[PDB]
From TrEMBL, chain A:
Residues 5-49 form a coiled coil. The lineage of its organism: Eukaryota, Metazoa, Chordata, Craniata, Vertebrata. This is Kinesin family member 13A. It is found in: Cytoplasm, Cytoskeleton. Belongs to the TRAFAC class myosin-kinesin ATPase superfamily. Kinesin family. The gene is Kif13a. The chain holds residues 360 to 441 of 1749 of the full protein.
From TrEMBL, chain B:
The lineage of its organism: Eukaryota, Metazoa, Chordata, Craniata, Vertebrata. Belongs to the TRAFAC class myosin-kinesin ATPase superfamily. Kinesin family. This is Kinesin family member 13A. It is found in: Cytoplasm, Cytoskeleton. Residues 3-47 form a coiled coil.
Amino acid sequence: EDPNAKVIRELREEVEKLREQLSQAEAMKAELKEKLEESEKLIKELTVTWEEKLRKTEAIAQERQRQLESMGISLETSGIK
Amino acid sequence: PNAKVIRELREEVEKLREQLSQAEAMKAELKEKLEESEKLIKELTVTWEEKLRKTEAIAQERQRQLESMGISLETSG
């Protein structure tokens, strides 16, 4: 129990080290879950932002088409194609 | 003997190592999902920008058509 207590002690150090590393891991897991939440959130937001942008620009395109068409219509109501 | 308190200590070590291995695995998985998320934000930005570039190009083409008809209308009555 002198090179045998010396093994026991080492194993106690070992168990402690493992406890601390487990604590660390679980911490890191939580940190990552949170960062991930944040980036998924930002993805949803950016998507909404982009959708709205596209919809505006499409609205303008459509308006312009519509005017070109106004002209075409009042043009061939005069029989001209 | 009485020095078979050792056995139960390394039994404890084995339990802990396995708990740690699974945690580190879950952490690795989260790290990966996070990286995927960031890569994805970059991609979205690229594809949306491109979609918009195409849409704006069409809007503008149509604008030039209307300006061309404006010119054609002034060069009449």
